[PDB]
Design a protein around this ligand. Structure first.
Ligand SMILES: *Cc1c(COP(=O)(O)O)cnc(C)c1O
Ligand SMILES: *Cc1c(COP(=O)(O)O)cnc(C)c1O
Lengths: 780, 780
């Protein structure tokens, strides 16, 4: 403890240039971060000197100090030293800005994968773009959504480390010149790529992997010419905000090309400097593509093999196929990347030529087998020419990889059988399944220390490594003291989150109330509108007769929206209006409060997840591939309600469908409704409560100033409904009534909570990473 | 020594994240810089907790590590430790990038002033803009000038330190609102100002002052909106390249306003947090304005006193006058700032109103004394309305300060008597004289260690503090061994610089040759064209008859030009053409070489100054205010030739006019020639050598490809000559012949060198800072 205090004081003195009489809390935080980095740096150095290379455009890391101290096993001594110094740890932690470099589940899964590979001892690297601005910081002004820039690097970064040695040139634009010896790509602008190294420690395993982020620079080759160096740096400037939607901008194509080029050149440099010549490259380099975003890594690797290395074309394509593995995350038609040919030709002419060459070879190979198939010729191509010609990047990832994945069992089946039937039937073993997972360290040990300690008191500490040990908690279903203590830790977390909520939102929180939380990105397919309709329903139920007993229920809905997405903004406005009406009704009192959680992120989830009682995953069945939020909920002692979709099917299989509240129509029923013809007015006319709620929304009950504030939402619900909000309202209300009736009995509620806890060990990210290593990457 | 090795190794381990088997030389340099910063940080902290506040737009610092180790007195132990590690110190030093934040003499004088205030123990601060790009890096391509961006911060900065605590808001644009209580300036854009602290150690005195640089940021209040945050950061981006010329851009006005606003608010914050209420402000804050660049500090201080503090107008103006002191650096009519009223009104409406108010009060005060003077009413105003109305910022600095200065005795006399006669006769004691100086530490102890050690062996080490002890070297004029050893150290420095030159320029350097150097910014008034004409003259002299004896003379001319200044670029082209012709003549051999020094800066001057034999300061008399280059030359054992101008008059007074080679027409003779009517053709027709040189230039002798390459230079020399190049050629040639004849005798040359060395103690910056403190700032 004395050594850590001396190190902290020395870092305050020399590194910060400060004394105890002037240092702010930010300086103390920086000193603590520097001393924990000094604690990890020796093993980081030792680890730096087959390998996996994970290539994502997003890494939703969050906050580092607490996770690093948990993974290093230095919490007791550090907390004791901070106490003896005379400081609090909560404000020091709150000083740190989150690395909000991911939009949502994809980047969060990438970060969990990095933590799992570090914990399992694998030799892996992370690769991405060092965005100076994350998603954004969200604030509610006049009940609306306003976005402000997220400057997470203004005050410094005590974790990353620039590497001047490994700066690489990335070329843009130009022309193709044909010569006898190779193909020449010339007249190109050069953009520099500067790497920054962020450690990724493993839990108690002496392994510190690396997260390398590429920072754009300018070549040094007049004032306006100096002010135009920002255009080269305009890539790596700001993370794009779309969660699933695909824009099609010339920017973010430069970002994709920049990251894939820099990463491929860095790995090739690392391989050439090894003892290993390119016939062993697929045996030493496995490149995992998170989504269709790093799809240009296939033609770029082809360009390096065929032009810079002048390898034979056939061998180069063989090595590229043996090196790449593909993972699919979305199925939504508007969520699929299709870059127009003209934009790529302007930006990447050599890559467009390589894409045409790969397409021609693949089409000839397919037409050899199927002389009769003419429509298959158009279907299986890498180019779509219905209007303007566009490049199906998913097809390019398919043909260029030796594996293809889905994020869930249902999603894997859909992509293999429905989405990519033509590719799958020819290559049956290529298409596989890997169900997502969440790291126990960040989401149980860091997120919920009380529940983690309670579990460790029963089944030991071995569950951290392998989450499947949670099944040993089934032996404690008979005991009642354990259920009481479980409810007690839930109530303690609820009290802490209520302390947060009261100060932050100026609303009094009933502490015995059920915490009903729905945190996710605001999408139409995620159906926050159904939750809004339900809260208006139970508000009207309270208004009808206050004599009847009601369940004390706190409703929390928090998530960001795309800045250009109007309907999500309208849904946020409706949530804020309903919260304003319901919170300020004397008749309701402490029966129904609606809080719109603000600036939802990893750090905020580390506080709202361990206090949740009911989880809302009510997306339309067949529209969600897989979400990791419900896994965190199920891990942190929360009962889940929702549809049979995404990871909900796996959770219902693992714990039992009777231990979850499953409502709504299934995928087959959704398809049957689509075939029959969906009309929302018929559902509207046949329900009194739903009709009352919709009429109140339309009649300006929540918008006294503008009578037509929610006409957009009303028209979307009635005449252009796409995700069947009305067709699931009846089942949603019935299951919410069942939830309320079950909450009245602590015994049954705690029994189902224990059943969900003991059956969530499957959804660890260690399991997913082991499947990835032993079935795709072929490492260890 | 062992402690320093351990500290270096520990900094390599933790700070750099590197091991000895992979670390480059850059990492070793960073470790050394970090350990010397750790050596200074304790006294920096102790010093941080009346004061002088020096406000410059330029700080031409150069390289820090060597200067810091010299001022800290830690050279022997550091060199021994670096040797025992197994490294060289020269490449580690060459790793560091110069802080080229100054265009020329002004920023260099500012840096010397900071070093002198630190050395003298004063409580002073530096204030300026943290430019990400300096002047530029200069390279010669095809004999022409090309500019590349100077990215001195790409790989880090082991000296500065950001201060998040002292971020301040700077407001731009807006409108003026008139109310009963004060004046309101509203509808303004906010630009953040983030300070960075760079230490300024004093020589062996336990005083480490601060250099605070303001970095522009953006307020956090959509992709394009994120890409437009660079416009706010476009100030503090790049240093403007003009040396004396005034552009008149909307940018660099935002820079001036930004720096003055941030500095004034910071100092006011520091004063309010002290034990001292505003009646004591002039007794505790002295703000020195380097040039007319921070002229807006007067109306901004008035705005803070009258609006933010609501002090009475009369008291506020009193305090502002008692706080400010002005220093003049230039006299050239095109070098004087005159901001148009419309641009300031668009940018600073409240400041324009304050400027009008000050102007009205001053004009009323003057017209009270002089009812008859009508032309004086127009002359003494702060506004000139010949065409578009412009603000004479020099007048504003005059009226708003309690002192006014010139950089030389002649310059002070000119500004008091000729430039500002009306202001000076009313306020006789306000106008003063302070002659510039150079710090001995950087320019003798760091620049020329051999000469410094030789001097210390004779008159002790006390000369470092007070340079006036150099007069004790007059007792060694009789001895011949001392003169021989002086020539020996000159030859050693010459050998080192020849080792540099041979590798850098692919030219063989005669080591017994005289080093003829002219390093300064390429200006017409600095007359590098006269030197080019002289070198062509002696080349033709060699060509005429190689039998005649010639002096081995190496001619070096190096300096940067303004990117928009065409004539300087043409002069550089002419120098390169003449160098190409002369260097590649077999007849000349080792008699005449011309090297155009590349990328001239502080670090390069630390190598070329201590090897110089003859100094070229041949600016037209009356056009140069004062230069500090000739002071460095005279300090480092070099004989000076030139005109009676700038500091040359003071040097001739201090050492003796017979100990300098003074030629050309004086200021009175220049004025007489101007009155008579200057015609260059008459001088052209009456000289055979000059006519031959000019004909060769015009006849394409140096430009075989383009016969008319130098027609611009020829027309400027003949029909639009402004600085009388031809009228001084005769005297220049005669004095160069005298120099060559004197160089043949080592005894006379060494006698004059010793005389110049012993009479340069006046030009220390300690003398200038003492005069500033005891006559203007009233500190200590
Ligand atoms: C778990 C996680 C998510 C995942 O959201 P889903 O909609 O379930 O995919 C999003 N944000 C944060 C901060 C998370 O921790
Ligand atoms: C001394 C110094 C100057 C001063 O130049 P002058 O023309 O004499 O004013 C310029 N550059 C550097 C690097 C210097 O050290």
């Amino acid at each position: 403890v004395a050594e850590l205090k001396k190190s902290f004081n020395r870092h305050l003195h020399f590194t910060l240039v400060k004394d105890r009489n002037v240092a702010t809390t930010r300086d103390y935080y920086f000193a603590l971060a520097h001393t924990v980095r000094d604690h990890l740096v020796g093993r980081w150095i030792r680890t730096q000197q087959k390998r996996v290379y994970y290539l994502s455009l997003e890494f939703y890391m969050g906050r580092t100090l607490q996770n690093t101290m948990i993974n290093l096993g230095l919490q007791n001594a550090c907390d004791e030293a901070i106490y003896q110094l005379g400081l609090d740890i909560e404000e020091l932690e709150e000083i740190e800005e989150d690395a909000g470099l991911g939009n949502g589940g994809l980047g969060r899964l990438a970060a969990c994968f990095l933590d799992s590979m570090a914990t399992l001892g694998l030799a892996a690297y992370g690769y991405g773009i060092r965005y100076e601005y994350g998603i954004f910081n969200q604030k509610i002004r006049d009940g609306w959504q306003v976005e402000e820039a997220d400057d997470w690097l203004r005050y410094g970064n005590p974790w990353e480390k620039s590497r001047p040695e490994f700066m690489l040139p990335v070329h843009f634009y130009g022309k193709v010149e044909h010569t006898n010896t190779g193909t020449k790509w010339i007249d190109t602008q050069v953009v520099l790529a500067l790497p920054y190294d962020t450690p990724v420690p493993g839990y108690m395993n002496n392994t510190v992997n690396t997260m390398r982020l590429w920072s754009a620079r300018a070549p040094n080759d007049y004032i306006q010419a100096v002010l135009d160096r920002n255009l080269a740096e305009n890539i790596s400037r700001v993370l794009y905000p779309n969660d699933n939607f695909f824009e099609g901008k010339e920017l973010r194509l430069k970002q994709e090309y920049f990251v894939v080029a820099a990463t491929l050149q860095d790995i090739i440099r690392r391989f050439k400097a090894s003892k290993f010549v390119f016939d062993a490259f697929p045996d030493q380099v496995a490149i995992q593509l998170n989504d269709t975003h790093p799809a240009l890594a296939i033609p770029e690797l082809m360009r390096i093999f065929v032009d810079i290395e002048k390898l034979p074309w056939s061998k180069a394509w063989e090595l590229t196929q043996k090196t790449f593995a593909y993972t699919n995350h979305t199925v939504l038609p508007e969520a699929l990347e299709r870059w127009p040919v003209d934009l790529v030709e302007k930006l990447l002419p050599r890559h467009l030529e390589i894409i045409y060459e790969i397409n021609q070879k693949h089409l000839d190979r397919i037409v050899a087998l199927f002389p009769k198939d003419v429509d298959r010729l158009r279907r299986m191509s890498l180019i779509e020419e219905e209007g303007s010609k566009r490049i199906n990047m998913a097809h390019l990832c398919i043909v260029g990889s030796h594996a293809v994945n889905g994020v869930a069992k249902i999603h894997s089946d859909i992509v293999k059988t429905k989405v990519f039937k033509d590719f799958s039937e020819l290559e049956p073993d290529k298409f596989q399944n890997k169900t997502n997972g969440i790291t126990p360290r960040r989401w149980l040990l860091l997120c919920n220390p009380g529940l983690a300690e309670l579990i460790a008191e029963k089944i030991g500490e071995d569950y951290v490594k392998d989450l499947s040990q949670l099944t040993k908690l089934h032996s404690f279903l008979g005991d009642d003291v354990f259920l009481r203590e479980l409810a007690k830790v839930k109530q303690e977390n609820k009290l802490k989150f209520s302390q947060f909520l009261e100060t932050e939102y100026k609303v009094k929180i009933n502490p015995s109330s059920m915490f009903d939380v729905q945190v996710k990105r605001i999408h139409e397919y995620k159906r926050q509108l159904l939750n809004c309709l339900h809260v208006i329903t139970m508000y009207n139920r309270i208004k009808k007769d206050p004599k009847k007993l009601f369940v004390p229920r706190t409703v929390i809905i928090g998530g960001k929206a795309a800045p250009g997405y109007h309907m999500a903004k309208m849904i946020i406005k409706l949530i804020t209006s309903v919260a304003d009406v319901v919170n300020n009704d004397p008749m309701v009192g402490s029966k129904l409060k609606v809080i719109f959680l603000e600036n939802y992120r990893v750090s905020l989830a580390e506080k709202v997840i361990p206090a949740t009682d009911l989880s809302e995953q009510i997306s339309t069945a067949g529209t969600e591939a897989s979400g990791t939020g419900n896994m965190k909920f199920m891990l942190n002692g929360a009962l889940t309600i929702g549809t049979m979709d995404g990871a909900n099917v796996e959770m219902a299989e693992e714990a039992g469908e009777e231990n979850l509240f499953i409502f709504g129509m299934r995928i087959d029923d959704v398809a049957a409704l689509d075939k029959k013809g969906y009309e929302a007015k018929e559902y509207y006319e046949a329900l009194p409560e739903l009709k009352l709620v919709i009429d109140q929304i339309d009649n300006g009950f929540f918008s006294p100033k503008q009578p037509d504030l929610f006409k957009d939402i009303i028209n979307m619900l009635f005449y252009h409904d796409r995700f069947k909000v009305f067709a699931d309202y009846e089942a949603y209300v019935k299951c919410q009534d069942k939830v309320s009736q079950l909450y009245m009995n602590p015994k049954a509620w705690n029994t189902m909570v224990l059943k969900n806890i003991a059956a969530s060990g499957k959804f660890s990210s260690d399991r997913t990473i082991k499947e990835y290593a032993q079935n795709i990457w072929n490492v260890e």
